[PDB]
Symmetry: C3
Subunit: 331 residues, 3 copies
Amino acid sequence: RCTHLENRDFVTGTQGTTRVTLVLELGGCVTITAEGKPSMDVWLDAIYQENPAKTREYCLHAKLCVKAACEAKKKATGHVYDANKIVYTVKVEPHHSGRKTASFTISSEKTILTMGEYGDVSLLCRVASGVDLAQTVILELDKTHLPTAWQVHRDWFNDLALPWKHEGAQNWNNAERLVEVYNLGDQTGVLLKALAGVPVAHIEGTKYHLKSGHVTCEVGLEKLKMKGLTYTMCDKTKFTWKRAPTDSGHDTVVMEVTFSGTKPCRIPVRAVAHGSPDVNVAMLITPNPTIENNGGGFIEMQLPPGDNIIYVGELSHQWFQKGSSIGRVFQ
Amino acid sequence: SRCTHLENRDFVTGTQGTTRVTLVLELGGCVTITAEGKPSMDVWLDAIYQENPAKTREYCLHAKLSDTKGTVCKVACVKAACEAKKKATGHVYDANKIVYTVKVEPHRKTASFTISSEKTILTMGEYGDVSLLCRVASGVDLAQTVILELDPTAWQVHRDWFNDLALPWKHEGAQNWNNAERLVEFDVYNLGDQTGVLLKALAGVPVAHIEGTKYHLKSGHVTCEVGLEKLKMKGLTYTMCDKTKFTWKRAPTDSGHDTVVMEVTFSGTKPCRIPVRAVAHGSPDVNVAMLITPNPTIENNGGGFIEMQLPPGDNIIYVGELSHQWFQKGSSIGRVF
Amino acid sequence: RCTHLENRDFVTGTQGTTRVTLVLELGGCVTITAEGKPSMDVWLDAIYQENPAKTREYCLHAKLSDTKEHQGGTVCKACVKAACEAKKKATGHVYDANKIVYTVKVEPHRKTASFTISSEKTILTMGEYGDVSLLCRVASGVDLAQTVILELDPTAWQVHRDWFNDLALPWKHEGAQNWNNAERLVEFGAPHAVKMDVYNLGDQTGVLLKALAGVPVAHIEGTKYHLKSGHVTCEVGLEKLKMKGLTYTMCDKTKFTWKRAPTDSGHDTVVMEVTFSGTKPCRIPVRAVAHGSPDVNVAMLITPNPTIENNGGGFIEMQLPPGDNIIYVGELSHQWFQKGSSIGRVFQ
């Protein structure tokens, strides 16, 4: 599942310093190996924020001149991320055992690790969200056998035509949106209809996970002869679709290919926008798609809106990319 | 050509034959990289855009009404709709969907990057397999931007300005307009077409360059690290241009995207590095010029264009002994509508 | 105070180019030194924006005129003209992330360079070191998109956008002739048939100050709106020079004491100071554990390389996960409770 470090991706100095550049996408692993020392696996294991700030609470079903209240367990709550509080956890392990862990944020970039056999190693990781956090709100329903947490657009959330308040307030704002005597009933159904196909938010306890993002690390090694490899290009005539291009569930395109040639090798990947077959429009999330002796074959990418053609050598598949949207209209 | 040559300081050659090259490519900025016995290659940032950004609020500039009695009420009521082609629509960028297209051509390969897509391998032919790692950087604070477009037709407006626009609004797909009474005064009178009042408020506001579906940005850069193998990289170093031989081709002016642009002519020996700085009137020791142009140079045929950011107030730009006073206006969300 | 550049942090090329990678947090200094040349101190001196854009103005105290309807700037049920009291506004300011300046200073044992998101590269003539290319990637310590500077006529705070936007007070933009939602500071009593009672809710400065308790303060130095969090990551390019390579030994874990026990920095981080009684200079062993696991290090240092120098050192800044944590500085330990995120206290 791990890609090997290539010669081009590291530099060895006259004064014995090795500078390595790793691009680690969520779930992506790179194997770094030095002479006489066991090979180490380096990967981005998680992207999350624990307990993000609660913003507006929307009422889905209004209750009760007497004050308008909300029905029991009938709220839709918003949560906002703090881009500087999101944790990117990098794990280092040989080949559990001598597994090192380092967490980074926008604010915390540098750490010195004692990689045992590789000695004191400097790790400088620049984090990069796969989500435009400024335009995101986590919409969550009250605990009751369905997805009840979504990643919605800020402009959609803020203009939700429902009564609202902040936790601690004892008065609902714009309660006349469900009340007046006129009562409009439970709007959970209308909301769920609008949230169809919208990315679900992975919450594991207090950890609010992100399913997209990477880290670009500058690794500093001292006094060691780094074993560098170079991949040959995979034969374009020996690819098959294990998994044809599909929506990842976080605004990317995922696919998996089968290789029936000599391994390991570099996967030839490109995409063309309809009309121009010369320009490559594939923007890979997978920094180096390869076929390994062990595994390999999974490719993630961004594509322009419209009709595209993905090429994995001579293997092709058309892909229609939908345009951007703040969400479906709610009334 | 405005292509700058790669300098010795901008690359490192390893013991195990690896060359690491750092390029700073601002929109329209080009760098020429050259290897021993191999032809020279031009590397530039060609475009920054997002295709079809998400539609946010639609504002009504001119109310279309029905007969007196999705309604505005006094009791007398009218049905309030919008006039044909009289909307002002908002569009939001997805920072991770903005494409930064890098082109490589001798003296042709294309690679696109986003916040999410940073790495590619490109077969540059005589240079072999080349790893390209580009960190993209918007020249616009995207979180505080809304693209306002009429049915110059488009502008880059501040989010806080857009959100508080005193006009009726709705989202694409909604039947009724919110706050329709903003264009209805009570006998029912219509406040008329507000396009004129809006155009007056949008004066001098940065225009949004829309090329079909491509919503362009005219500000931004990419910082790339280039990995080359088994090749003798040519190392060139620019001498500083003579401070006494500069003259204004185009005196400092607004770029149209919150920067200061200018052009200079050089009468001395070329090519050389342009000496550029600025001082806040009163403080003459501190350099306050923040160049958008990573390496301003005078080329044998070409060079002389300088882009920079400056602090608010009274500044004095220096291109060697050549000087020009520049007044920098402060930040604003926009004019009150 | 200044830490020394380590061997791992720089690479020397075959064609005589040295590439140094510096991480400079606000107030953090790194000493770079070359054989036969004087030492140079490199630090991030300031992070600020001059005159950020003014957004909404909120009224804290209503200036109600004459108690007597189709007019703009009145509250009705009898009608009174509603304006704001003199110097009783709470103004919002938004940063332009691309307009924030990160000033790097270089001095022996003096040159200045300013960077922004948009301006990354500059060439400096470091004198004894010759022409040095400086490429600094700036990084705000504050999520600017979710921040508003709230200032009164302590003067200013960094508040959350969602909190600011939903403030239950009358508002307007500079230049507008009338206040929106002015009825938020007007109260109407039972009518006396010939006259109706009109009350003013009074000055709300007090209620606001109570809600802004513990909220990070905005440091305004004239026109300069400062940030107290953030760093810059610089790629420093040097020519034809023998760069001195130093490597720190690890500090003895048994010789640390608390000069200052873990505390809130005032900008969403944890700060502390330790004293060292062993042989100097050395690298400080710093780690932290959270309730969730005892094996995983959860300390996210703001201080790129905490060291004990001959000339000071011992100050450590870090981010920690929410909840119960235990900070370790060798064998020296201290528990730290980290409060979770919040847009702010409910304002009435």
